[PDB]
Scaffold this active site. Structure first.
Site, PDB file in Angstrom:
ATOM      1  N   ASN A  15       1.395  31.074  43.186  1.00  0.00           N
ATOM      2  CA  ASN A  15       0.472  30.016  43.647  1.00  0.00           C
ATOM      3  C   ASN A  15      -0.969  30.265  43.163  1.00  0.00           C
ATOM      4  O   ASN A  15      -1.450  31.383  43.231  1.00  0.00           O
ATOM      5  CB  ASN A  15       0.481  30.018  45.188  1.00  0.00           C
ATOM      6  CG  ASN A  15      -0.013  28.701  45.803  1.00  0.00           C
ATOM      7  OD1 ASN A  15       0.072  27.641  45.199  1.00  0.00           O
ATOM      8  ND2 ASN A  15      -0.514  28.783  47.046  1.00  0.00           N
ATOM      9  N   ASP A  66       2.685  37.499  42.182  1.00  0.00           N
ATOM     10  CA  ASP A  66       2.446  36.635  43.410  1.00  0.00           C
ATOM     11  C   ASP A  66       3.783  36.133  44.058  1.00  0.00           C
ATOM     12  O   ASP A  66       4.734  36.926  44.212  1.00  0.00           O
ATOM     13  CB  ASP A  66       1.447  35.489  43.040  1.00  0.00           C
ATOM     14  CG  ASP A  66       0.920  34.697  44.251  1.00  0.00           C
ATOM     15  OD1 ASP A  66      -0.015  35.199  44.903  1.00  0.00           O
ATOM     16  OD2 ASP A  66       1.392  33.561  44.525  1.00  0.00           O
ATOM     17  N   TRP A  67       3.879  34.847  44.424  1.00  0.00           N
ATOM     18  CA  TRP A  67       5.149  34.281  44.904  1.00  0.00           C
ATOM     19  C   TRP A  67       6.289  34.422  43.887  1.00  0.00           C
ATOM     20  O   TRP A  67       7.458  34.450  44.271  1.00  0.00           O
ATOM     21  CB  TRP A  67       4.984  32.833  45.375  1.00  0.00           C
ATOM     22  CG  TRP A  67       4.410  32.802  46.774  1.00  0.00           C
ATOM     23  CD1 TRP A  67       3.116  32.541  47.138  1.00  0.00           C
ATOM     24  CD2 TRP A  67       5.120  33.102  47.980  1.00  0.00           C
ATOM     25  NE1 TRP A  67       2.979  32.634  48.512  1.00  0.00           N
ATOM     26  CE2 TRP A  67       4.193  32.975  49.058  1.00  0.00           C
ATOM     27  CE3 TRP A  67       6.449  33.439  48.258  1.00  0.00           C
ATOM     28  CZ2 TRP A  67       4.557  33.172  50.388  1.00  0.00           C
ATOM     29  CZ3 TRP A  67       6.825  33.660  49.600  1.00  0.00           C
ATOM     30  CH2 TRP A  67       5.877  33.514  50.650  1.00  0.00           C
ATOM     31  N   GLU A 124       1.024  42.669  41.616  1.00  0.00           N
ATOM     32  CA  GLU A 124       0.336  41.861  42.629  1.00  0.00           C
ATOM     33  C   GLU A 124       1.367  41.111  43.493  1.00  0.00           C
ATOM     34  O   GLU A 124       1.335  39.883  43.642  1.00  0.00           O
ATOM     35  CB  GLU A 124      -0.696  40.943  41.941  1.00  0.00           C
ATOM     36  CG  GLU A 124      -2.026  41.685  41.673  1.00  0.00           C
ATOM     37  CD  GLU A 124      -2.712  42.023  42.983  1.00  0.00           C
ATOM     38  OE1 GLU A 124      -2.801  41.101  43.842  1.00  0.00           O
ATOM     39  OE2 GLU A 124      -3.141  43.181  43.162  1.00  0.00           O
ATOM     40  N   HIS A 150      -6.355  39.552  41.281  1.00  0.00           N
ATOM     41  CA  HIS A 150      -5.018  39.048  41.644  1.00  0.00           C
ATOM     42  C   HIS A 150      -4.266  38.479  40.453  1.00  0.00           C
ATOM     43  O   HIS A 150      -3.090  38.808  40.246  1.00  0.00           O
ATOM     44  CB  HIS A 150      -5.091  38.014  42.765  1.00  0.00           C
ATOM     45  CG  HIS A 150      -3.746  37.515  43.201  1.00  0.00           C
ATOM     46  ND1 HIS A 150      -2.773  38.352  43.701  1.00  0.00           N
ATOM     47  CD2 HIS A 150      -3.199  36.276  43.178  1.00  0.00           C
ATOM     48  CE1 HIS A 150      -1.693  37.646  43.999  1.00  0.00           C
ATOM     49  NE2 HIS A 150      -1.925  36.383  43.687  1.00  0.00           N
TER      50      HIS A 150
HETATM   51 CL   LIG Z   1      -0.080  31.752  48.899  1.00  0.00          CL
END
Ligand SMILES: [Cl-]
Ligand SMILES: OC[C@H]1O[C@@](CO)(O[C@H]2O[C@H](CO)[C@@H](O)[C@H](O)[C@H]2O)[C@@H](O)[C@@H]1O
Ligand SMILES: OC[C@H]1O[C@@](CO)(O[C@H]2O[C@H](CO)[C@@H](O)[C@H](O)[C@H]2O)[C@@H](O)[C@@H]1O
Ligand SMILES: [Cl-]
Lengths: 291, 293
Positions: free
Chosen positions: B33, B98-99, B122, B268
């Site tokens: 995201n 991330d996701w 991350e 990130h």
């Molecule tokens: Cl998120």
């Protein structure tokens, strides 16, 4: 990283060492007219995964300067003795230029020593001058013909320092900073100190000469084509000793050989691509050791 | 050469970028995201010489379809599973951030035989408290995400103000993106309603047992990851965001066959600061593994 020194065959070889020593060993092998200096920006990228050792060949960098011929076979003896002195029983090899000939020859004589070979801009037997450098580099062909000529090579390399002052910068795309170029010059203050730099182009296996090196490198290349250890070949564009097109054919002629394309590059690829080379090598070692 | 294609998936479609020889191992690149396969654009060319690279846009992201769904974590699981089936992929390396990492871990926990290796950074893990979300020097991030998760407030920030795209995204990149680099991050999200999947995600983060189903799934997935025997490559930045360098070294050392690659200054969205380092690392690693088998 401290430069360290090892006693070797009654002389000494300087070397850089970094990385945890519970990890696999990686030996970095420079060629002409460089030293372990050329690996300086690659070592910190590989040290997190491997015990890195980068020797200066006898008569190069901070190594001793014995009064010897500095033929290819002399380098073989000193490198073998260094490996023994360091107690290294197996290693990955990362090599460029004459370092690749040492690596190939070592792998041929000791196949169980080699964990893997990462190489670039390598030496192979060259049946004719058309096999040395590329067609846009006729001027390089002409310079090396002179290096190999009695009297002329002495004037160019021993007296004029042409390999350090012209060939080296001519094989790097970017312009080295003063502080980066200085350690290339410091090993070679005098004509006599430049003896090993002249000996090397006279060892290049071209048109059957010198016959002993030509045969040894034919044999080493036969062994390499029959080997089963992982190989990683880097190429620049247009490269120098190795074109992108030759690299593709060469890699396909081997088993377990990947080809990594670096982009704009000539002979001394480390100087233009240190980060790409170090990252690639560290990933490759991590992958091999995982499985 | 890198092509952008579309696959029919569960009555909608997912867009994907594809490059590399068809006879090479597959590598599946999974964004999070509020990004898309755009985030891999400078990494793909570095891996494609050794692998068949496939980089999908998650449902509701990038150029993928925007079906009328909740866009919960389990919806992404279903669409990604259907994409993989549609492309006829039977095994792949996973590269994730991330996701994307939650999807990769959950996939690997259910189908470990599918996983040739996992390169990740991350990443999302169950976080018993807010203290486990980002580092203590980023209290600001915790307050922002608490607000995302709050009914009404999150809508105002993410749907109306587009805060995730306009603030959170550039906030997790060290360099400043060129206008031409930033534009494709905005174009999937022209309207507040188009931003629904972007709002759905922070509300799925497994923090303090909520939501319970995602928390449970990611606990099970992390247990599987801890025991897993496939090759792993973890990248870390300094200071990072979800993963500190110190946490990364301890986490990597805890796993089987996990190498840690330190990237230097990064937050990130490490791809945007370190594309070259990540691409070169992943390519050499795949080459090494496939050389020994
Ligand atoms: Cl998120
Ligand atoms: O496949 C990735 C990469 O690995 C290399 C060796 O580093 O080749 C291996 O994998 C190929 C595809 O599975 C096999 O065909 C090959 O025999 C094996 O060595 C590279 O050549 C390739 O780019
Ligand atoms: O060894 C380099 C690098 O490989 C990894 C896995 O990618 O560890 C492997 O190699 C170690 C040394 O041989 C083994 O002890 C380990 O079990 C094996 O997974 C990385 O952890 C390491 O940095
Ligand atoms: Cl030479």
């Amino acid at each position: 990283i401290e430069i360290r020194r090892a006693p070797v065959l009654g002389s000494s070889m300087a070397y850089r060492e970094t990385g945890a020593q519970d990890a696999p060993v990686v030996l970095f092998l420079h060629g002409n007219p460089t030293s372990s200096h050329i690996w300086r920006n690659i070592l910190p990228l590989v040290s997190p995964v491997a015990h890195c050792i980068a020797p200066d060949l006898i008569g190069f960098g901070q190594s001793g300067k014995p009064d010897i011929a500095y033929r290819f076979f002399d380098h073989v003896r000193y490198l073998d003795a260094f490996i023994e002195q360091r107690g290294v029983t197996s290693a990955y090899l990362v090599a460029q230029d004459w370092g690749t000939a040492l690596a190939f020859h070592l792998a041929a004589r000791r196949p169980d020593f080699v964990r893997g070979l990462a190489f670039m801009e390598f030496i192979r037997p060259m049946p004719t001058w058309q096999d040395f450098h590329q067609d846009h580099a006729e001027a390089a062909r002409a310079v090396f013909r002179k290096f190999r000529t009695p009297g002329e090579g002495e004037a160019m390399i021993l007296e004029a320092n042409a390999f350090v002052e012209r060939v080296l910068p001519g094989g790097i795309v970017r312009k080295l900073g003063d502080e980066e170029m200085a350690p290339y010059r410091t090993p070679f203050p005098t004509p006599e100190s430049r003896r090993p730099v002249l000996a090397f182009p006279r060892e290049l296996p071209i048109a059957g000469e010198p016959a002993d090196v030509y045969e040894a490198l034919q044999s080493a290349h036969a062994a390499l084509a029959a080997s089963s250890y992982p190989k990683l070949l880097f190429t620049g564009e247009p490269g120098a000793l190795v074109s992108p097109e030759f690299a593709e054919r060469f890699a396909a002629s081997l088993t377990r050989c990947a080809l990594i394309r670096l982009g704009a590059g000539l002979h001394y690829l480390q100087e233009d691509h240190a980060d790409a080379i170090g990252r690639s090598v560290a990933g490759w070692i991590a992958g091999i050791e995982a499985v």
